[model samples]
Target: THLTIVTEALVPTPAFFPLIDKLAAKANTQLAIITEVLAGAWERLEQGRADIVIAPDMHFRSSSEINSRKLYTLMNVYVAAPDHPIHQEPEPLSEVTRVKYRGIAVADTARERPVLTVQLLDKQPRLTVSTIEDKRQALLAGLGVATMPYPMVEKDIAEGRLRVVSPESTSEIDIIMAWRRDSMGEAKSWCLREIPKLFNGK
Candidate 1:
């Protein structure tokens, strides 16, 4: 059988791709992978075009038609260019309004928490992007600050292209693998068994 795997950009765990490849090899199944914005993935699944979805916890909760299992937790961090003034402050929000902020357009479930936090500080995003990679590039270009999964920006942060805005307030983003419970099949099961192993380094 051919397995259609859809994923949200926030997942940022390219490590999982190899696991999917291994599963396809072992199960003798063909795999078709589609990567999109979190909200777009939800629409794909709802329309019955995707057999399985790997996304953040927020995406899973927002889709009532799917069943999900927690795969792993990932740290989420705010990113800004190294020279941005937000980095020097003893309190970042005090300087937040002085700079442009870019919000990531993620699943509805994921959007609320971060938006609420920023609103509380009286800072709003200057723009919003649909994908994590776009957000990263925007930060690098000094378009604005953005929030993304730590693993996705780890190399950039280490290379000094970007810096974490508030490490303390950032929390782990849970990775969830989901599928339409009513449409169970070999492909979905194949993904479930293989994907989780990626988190364990199997």
Candidate 2:
């Protein structure tokens, strides 16, 4: 059987994709692995267009309709350049709402925690983009602020290329392997069995 798996795009991914690829070799089955934004994955799943999905708590509301297994957790954080106004401000997170947005430029994205999304868009320098990388680059240029998967920016933060914001803005997203409650049989079950080894002790 053919299996198509969609992974969440906002999380750090480089470390795990090779493991998935190895699984395909082990299973010796026809397979496709996709990593992209949450909505894109969901669209494929809901339309019965995908055989399976590797997801986060992004928007899977119909729990009973799908058989989802706990996968792993991913860390996401808000970041800005060390010298950007956001870091200089004593009350950056709060002051981000006022006129001049308290002296900071903010990089925006297609996705944000609901409250933050609405809050940010309500003000100036509201530049929004399609991907986190663009937002990260915007932050590097001191043009804005954004939330990005920690692993993707960990090196940047450590090397003084970027600084992390308040923990209040960080999120730990839960990932899962979800498919229709009655969809794939043992062929798909084999795929599920191999997920943990990819992130053992993770």
Candidate 3:
């Protein structure tokens, strides 16, 4: 059977591709993976366009029609360039101080639902982009601060290309895999059982 997987934009797509490819080959099934914003992924799954969805648990809603499982926990760190205004503030940047600078956000891909704005200050100067990579570039350019996946910006922080917000205001996001309750099959079951191991080595 052909399976379509939709993932939230925050997911590290490249890290999962090789494992997904191997899983499909072993299951002797065709699989497709698409990346979309948080709402977009749920929309595809609810509309029967996707057999699986991977996204953070914060926004996920359980229903009789869905089966969801936590795959891993991803840390989201607030970051900005070392020379950005936020860095000049005192240790443990307060909301009053942080909101004065611009914030970068990845625009949601939803066509109908209200778009999600993650980790941005309310009513602050904003620079929105269409993709995570673009957000990363914007942050690196000292345009704004943003909450980014640790893995995505690990090298940047290590190389001093970016710096985590003082006092490290970080959030732990539970990354989950969800599917329709009525759609279980061999391939889906295989993914449900093995995907977590692939991510967390558990």
Q: Determine which window of 10 residues in candidate 1 has minimal summed lDDT.
A: 112-121
Angstrom error at residue 199, model 3: 1.9
Q: Summarize candidate 3's per-residue lDDT along 62-117 as a digit string, tens digits.
A: 45578888888888898999898777777535678767888787766444554345
Regions of candidate 1 where Cα sits further than 4 Å from its true position: 19-29, 59-65, 95-125
- Model 2 error, position 77 (Å): 1.6
lDDT of each: 0.66, 0.65, 0.78
Better of 2 and 3 by lDDT: 3
Once fitted onto the true fold, the runs of candidate 3 whose alpha carbons sit more than 4 angstroms away are 20-24, 60-62, 109-118
Order of the predicted models by TM-score, top scorer first:
3, 2, 1
Q: Estimate each model's TM-score.
A: 0.76, 0.78, 0.86
Give the C-alpha miss distance for residue 176 in model 2, angstroms. 2.2
Per-residue lDDT of 39-142 in model 2, one digit per residue for the tens? 56666777776767776666543534777777677787777788877666677666543335422322322443222332354445556655666667877887
Q: Residue 142, candidate 1: how far off, in angstroms?
A: 2.2
lDDT by residue for model 1 over 1-202, one digit each (tens)?
Answer: 6777877776654665686556656777777787866556666777788888786654233455567778777777877899877777677755555444444433333332123223222355566555566667778886666567787788998999888887776876677787877766765676777777767741
* Rank ordering of all candidates by lDDT, starting from the highest: 3, 1, 2
